[PDB]
Design a binder for this molecule. Structure first.
Ligand SMILES: Nc1ncnc2c1ncn2[C@@H]1O[C@H](COP(=O)(O)OP(=O)(O)O)[C@@H](O)[C@H]1O
Lengths: 31, 191, 375, 81, 130, 130
């Protein structure tokens, strides 16, 4: 299916972006 | 029917057995997903927790009204070690006692495909004790049936006593599909 | 398919094994893919495969069509079992490397494969590369949560490498760790009787190994007590309680062993050091002033080199203090602690008893005397 | 085949819920940050910027100087002196 | 960085570089090259008699140089090459320029200027006129 | 060998305590038992998921008179250089009682009635020796 590798890439990207978002968010809370 | 259930799951090495396509691990994952969803759809106020039976028992998720977290925490369960059924069941009973909502029936459905290496005497004693604390231990057998079927019959018969439909035994030597076997089973039928 | 065909053929064309093929192949058709993971071991360890390429044929065909889902560690173990009866080391290295490549997820499987390939390099020689792989696998073995037979295999590999390179002290340490990791009773009595003897020799000739205690109590030494080599236990006991007299008595034999006979001088120096250590430990702090005449009556030397012996002890770090050779005595203010015996601990118990009595008496005296001002 | 449907059904049902939880309690975290950034800020300079993470030596317009070991909500966009 | 409430020293910090640093003529580095001074070769050669001081110290030992001299006067008309004259020579020397302007407050400022400087090298105190 | 430590409750409380204060991350666990149990290793294994260096602290509610009420343990599992079979067991960790200043104020206020002098009076020094 077209969506297998596309979804894998989209996941990887979204997960890394949200994890960076949470690094900064919890850093801001602790700040 | 307000319900609090604990899904015990064997993750022993014998889950490396691949009779259930594609693997016993994926088959049990699908079966637990199906049963948890079935319990949740009926009276969403019901809550479900999950137990891992390994070299030492563990509780991955306590009684919660959500199912996605249970699915996510089970997905990473890999086959390792050996089953300790008695300790798993005792942990399940402890979790039931500690459940936040005291207005629920007490159920424990155990994916126990493995040769249960425990002593028959303490086995029947545990079953009777659970019957006394009013527990319903449903048991899904897929594996060493020839070995554990009599002991599972002892489980369920002792729990039921007379007319005690609470505890059930479902054995599936054939491996067409564990999920379909579970969905077309008495345990989920009443829900 | 080809694997079922080979299964059916060797149902009777295989070694011995009348119906175990029937059960193995019916399980394989059942597609369990793991229930026979134990039968494969239980049968391959049978005295049937010693020089048979049939084992390699079995491996190729069905282990290649079977390895996609197997306990990685058991898979590597059977890989080593197949390799043992393969006598083409140049191709065995590549075979083990491809087994590695096949098994990546199981960190422990990678550990064991690296250990096996290092063992093969050792068996063919290649000291530099075997040392390199030992270092690599050690540093990436000290990364797992606990201990296992993989640690056992690594410590055996390190012991063998240090034995071949001659580093007796490191061999002693690593072999002791290996015996700790592995179960003593599972090993054959022959394997014990040999490993214990090698440990005895390494400790007997090791640089910086003075703690022969812990070995007279390690149960691995429960293999020479009645054997025709209880002599070795006797000698090691003599060093533990330095008895140069008894060691000269036991000279009746170790002159037979070429290595010890060649390294006599090292043995004599080490035993003299241990004798001085144990003398200092026995002497209480009241009169720890050891004398040159005392050390002479101890390990046999005239009083013109007790000075050098004590210098060596202090420099190595066995004891601490000074040497007043004008008055011909040695002041010891320390000893390197070692492992002791039940009687050596009963003596400590008695000394404590005395110390407790004195402390209690002084406590009662002070409390009674100052009773009227205690807050 | 079956592996494709598996990775498009179970993987999806798990990962979508994981992202949903992350993107819901990110909503909670961002709401808390927004509540804690109540408007009445004190206009101030960034007179000096240091590293050890980064720091600040901000000059509050109340003719005062305050070292900040943690810069805070700002994006650390190089915050030139 | 004292604590806000208990006023306890929590950490030491690098010295503040206020605008009164560069304007104080506190530029340590800076060279271009030797060939930019087209003429003035004799003056360059003469000024390179101050290079003996650092490269060695025979001024100690047999003799004494009372801390041998700290450069020459560079007597110059309205302006010919003074700055660059010193620049090229010191660039050869590999030293660095602490140029100083002398154009009790100013006295103390310059005093502290070289007191900070010498702890670190050609000093080029100039602008004596007026 | 059967216990029901509540991981969900643990994480919820840890999150709310993070919200209240941030420079306080899970560093271990405590149980008010005078003696250990076979469950201590298992519960420390559970806690190591929330902290790599998870430390047990047994805080004895029964008040003794010679030592501190806290005993600290760190779970170390390593191949015994001894050469003996190795099992995942605890190892003692040096423990001490210290206080923030805002806790010292409260402690002193609570103990004001039964406090001792913060000076060596001869009777108290003799008593301390006893
Ligand atoms: N010999 C020379 N070769 C090239 N340029 C020169 C020479 N002498 C002076 N100049 C130019 O004239 C300027 C003189 O600057 P400076 O020496 O600082 O002032 P003053 O000449 O008044 O001492 C320099 O910037 C330089 O560009």
């Amino acid at each position: 299916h077209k969506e297998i590798d596309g979804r894998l890439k989209e996941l990887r990207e979204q997960l890394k972006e949200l994890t960076k978002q949470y690094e900064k968010s919890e850093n801001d809370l602790k700040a | 029917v307000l319900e609090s259930t604990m899904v015990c799951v064997d993750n022993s090495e014998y889950m490396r057995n691949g009779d259930f396509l594609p693997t016993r691990l994926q088959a049990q994952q699908d079966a637990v997903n199906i049963v948890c969803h079935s319990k949740t759809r009926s009276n969403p106020e019901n809550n479900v927790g999950l137990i891992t039976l390994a070299n030492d028992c563990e509780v991955l998720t306590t009684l919660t009204p959500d199912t996605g977290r249970i699915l996510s925490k089970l997905h990473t369960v890999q086959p390792k070690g050996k089953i300790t059924f008695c300790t798993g069941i005792r942990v399940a009973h402890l979790a039931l006692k500690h459940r936040q909502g005291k207005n629920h029936k007490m159920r424990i459905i155990a994916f126990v495909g493995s040769p249960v290496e425990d002593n028959e005497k303490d086995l029947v004693k545990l079953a009777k004790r659970l019957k006394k604390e009013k527990v319903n231990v449903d048991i899904i057998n897929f594996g060493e049936e020839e070995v554990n079927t009599e002991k599972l019959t002892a489980f369920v018969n002792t729990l039921n006593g007379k007319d005690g439909t609470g505890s059930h035994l479902v054995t599936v030597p054939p491996g067409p599909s564990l999920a379909d076997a579970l969905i077309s089973s008495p345990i989920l039928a009443g829900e | 398919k080809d694997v079922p065909g080979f299964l059916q053929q060797s149902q009777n064309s295989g070694p011995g094994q009348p119906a175990v093929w029937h059960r193995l192949e019916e399980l394989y058709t059942k597609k369990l893919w793991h229930q026979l993971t134990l039968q494969v071991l239980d049968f391959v360890q049978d005295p049937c495969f010693a020089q048979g390429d049939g084992l390699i044929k079995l491996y190729e065909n069905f282990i290649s069509e079977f390895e996609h889902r197997v306990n990685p560690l058991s898979l590597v173990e059977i890989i080593l079992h197949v390799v043992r009866q393969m006598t083409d080391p140049n191709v065995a290295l590549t075979f083990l490397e491809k087994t590695r490549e096949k098994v990546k997820s199981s960190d422990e499987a990678v550990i064991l494969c690296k250990t096996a390939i290092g063992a093969l390099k050792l068996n063919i020689g290649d000291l530099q590369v075997t040392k390199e792989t030992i270092e690599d696998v050690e540093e990436m073995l000290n990364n797992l949560p606990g201990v296992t037979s993989v640690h056992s295999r690594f410590y055996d590999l390190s012991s063998k490498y240090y034995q071949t390179i001659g580093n007796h002290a490191s061999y002693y340490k690593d072999a002791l760790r290996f015996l700790g990791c592995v179960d003593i009773k599972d090993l054959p009595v022959s394997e014990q009787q040999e490993r214990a003897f090698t440990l005895g020799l390494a400790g007997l000739l090791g640089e910086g190994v003075f703690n022969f205690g812990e070995l007279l109590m390690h149960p691995v030494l429960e293999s020479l007590r009645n054997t025709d080599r209880q002599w070795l236990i006797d000698t090691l006991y003599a060093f533990n309680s330095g008895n140069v007299e008894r060691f000269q008595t036991l000279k009746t034999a170790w002159g037979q062993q070429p290595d010890l006979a060649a390294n006599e001088a090292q043995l004599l120096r080490k035993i003299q050091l241990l004798c001085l250590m144990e003398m200092t430990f026995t002497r209480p702090a009241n009169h720890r002033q050891l004398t040159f005449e005392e050390i002479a009556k101890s390990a046999k030397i005239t009083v013109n080199e007790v000075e050098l012996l004590v210098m060596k002890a202090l420099s190595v770090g066995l004891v601490k203090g000074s040497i007043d050779e004008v008055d011909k005595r040695v002041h010891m203010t320390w000893v390197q602690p070692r492992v002791l015996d039940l009687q050596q601990i009963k003596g400590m118990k008695d000394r404590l008893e005395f110390w407790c009595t004195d402390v209690k008496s002084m406590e009662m005296l002070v409390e009674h005397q100052a009773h009227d001002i205690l807050t | 085949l079956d592996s494709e449907i598996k990775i498009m059904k179970s993987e999806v049902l798990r990962v979508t819920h994981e992202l949903q939880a992350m993107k819901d309690k990110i909503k909670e975290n961002s709401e808390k940050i927004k509540v804690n950034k109540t408007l009445p800020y004190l206009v101030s300079n960034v007179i000096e910027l240091l590293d050890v993470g980064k720091c600040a030596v901000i000059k509050t317009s109340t003719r005062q100087t305050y070292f900040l070991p943690v810069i805070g909500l700002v994006d650390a966009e190089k915050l030139k002196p | 960085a004292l604590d806000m409430t208990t006023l306890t020293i929590m950490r030491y910090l690098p010295r503040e570089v206020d605008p009164l640093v560069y304007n104080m003529s506190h530029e340590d580095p800076g060279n271009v090259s030797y060939s930019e001074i087209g003429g003035l070769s004799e003056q360059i050669r003469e000024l390179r008699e101050v290079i003996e001081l650092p490269l060695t110290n025979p001024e100690l030992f047999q003799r004494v140089g009372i801390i041998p001299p700290k450069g020459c006067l560079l007597y110059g008309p309205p302006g010919t090459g003074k700055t660059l004259l010193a620049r090229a020579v010191a660039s050869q020397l590999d030293c660095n320029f602490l140029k100083v302007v002398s154009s009790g407050e100013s006295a103390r400022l310059i005093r502290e200027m070289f007191n900070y400087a010498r702890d670190h090298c050609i000093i080029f105190m100039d602008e004596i006129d007026a | 060998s059967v216990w029901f430590l509540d991981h969900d409750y643990l994480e919820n409380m840890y999150g709310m305590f993070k919200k209240v204060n941030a420079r306080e991350r899970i560093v271990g666990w405590y149980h008010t038992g005078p003696k250990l149990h076979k469950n201590d290793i298992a519960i420390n294994e559970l806690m190591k998921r929330y902290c790599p260096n998870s430390v047990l602290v047994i805080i004895d509610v029964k008040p003794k008179d010679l030592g501190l009420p806290t005993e600290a343990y760190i779970s170390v599992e390593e191949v015994h250089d001894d050469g003996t079979p190795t099992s995942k067991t605890f190892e003692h960790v040096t423990s001490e009682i210290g206080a923030e200043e805002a806790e010292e104020v409260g402690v002193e206020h609570l103990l004001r009635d039964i406090k001792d002098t913060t000076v060596g009076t001869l009777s108290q020094r003799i008593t301390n020796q006893v």
